[model samples]
Target: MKKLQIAVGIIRNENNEIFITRRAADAHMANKLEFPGGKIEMGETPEQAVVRELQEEVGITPQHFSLFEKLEYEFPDRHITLWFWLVERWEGEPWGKEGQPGEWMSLVGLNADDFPPANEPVIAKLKRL
Candidate 1:
């Protein structure tokens, strides 16, 4: 089966808080927290996907970003490959442009349990920084 390719952003503000969003309760993963991201479109590079996803989800256009990690997981019902990026600079104040619930939580305040099981690796790495 083909895995869904996704580009995810770990957006940070000057105060050193990480931007996170809550998935819709009716959606799969059911209200688990998520970084801004979406499925990669055809012909789009992972970096470009990050820019687009953030713009669509958070109303911010990433200007300076760096590749951080690549992760893949299977959720029984779904398969995905996640490309993570550090979005250090952006155009606007980040918000839930999609009207999803979200917040900027400090790294130390983030809990692995608040996110989807597949995001464990990403959560683990965030605490180390």
Candidate 2:
């Protein structure tokens, strides 16, 4: 199986809403939402990947963040191990740099089933915060 190492950021604004972006309509997991991030590079730390991916995908550089959780998930086509980071402070205004739609969603009213299975646990935890 093709295994991937992913680092994702769970960014929160003043109101404590987490930021999320939609996958491109034609992409895998199309239109499904996700926290901003990408794969870890060969020589990169998971934290480093989170910072870099945030800058690339959401136009922000996470200056202050913490490793929130880590999980392994297997998709039919591949397997992924994800590192989730909680980002309370950062530089730049986050957006969908790749033309995807980004939004800050209230966790209270959000449903875990609305996103990919890998993200459900994270969302469930967020609701308690």
Candidate 3:
């Protein structure tokens, strides 16, 4: 058994839509979607990890952001402690830097029915708050 520390975002642009990337159909999450981020490395805070991951995945440097919340859970594959952020600004238009085309989805209109499991709690939180 292993534990992983991860950082992720409910990243919204000017319009309030969060950025969700669809995992490649042949990939592990395979058509499942996720917020744009990844693991926290040694010596890095969660925020640093988020900035690094956003650049690695989407070619953007998220500027105006807030570390609003965190979530910890055990998925079937691993035990993860996730740091969540809300970002309203970033540099560079996102492209498939990680080779995954990300989509901008409205927070108000997010379909809990359609998103991947990882996003369910995030979506629910936004709806509740």
Cα deviation at 56, candidate 3, in Å, is 0.7
Q: Assess each prediction's global lDDT (C-alpha) against the native.
A: 0.88, 0.88, 0.80
Q: Could you tell me every candidate's TM-score relative to the true structure?
A: 0.94, 0.95, 0.86
lDDT per residue, candidate 2, 36-66, as tens digits?
8889999999989999999888899997788
lDDT of 1 at 56: 94
Candidate 1 lDDT, tens digit per residue, 1-129? Answer: 567998989998888799999999898788889998999999999888999999999999998788888988998788998898988898998888899987899987888898888788878887788
Error in Å for residue 99 of model 2: 1.2
Give the candidates in order of lDDT, highest first. 1, 2, 3
| Residue pairs in clash, model 3 | none
* Sliding window of 10 residues with minimal summed lDDT for model 3: 112-121
Model 1 TM: 0.94
Local accuracy of candidate 3 as per-residue lDDT tens digits, 1-129: 578998986777777777888877886457777788888999999889999999999888988788767878787877888788887788888777877777788788888766556657878887675
Model 1 lDDT, full chain set: 0.88
Clashes of each: 0, 0, 0
Candidate 1, run of 10 with poorest lDDT: 118-127
The TM-score of candidate 3 is 0.86
lDDT of 2 at 29: 70
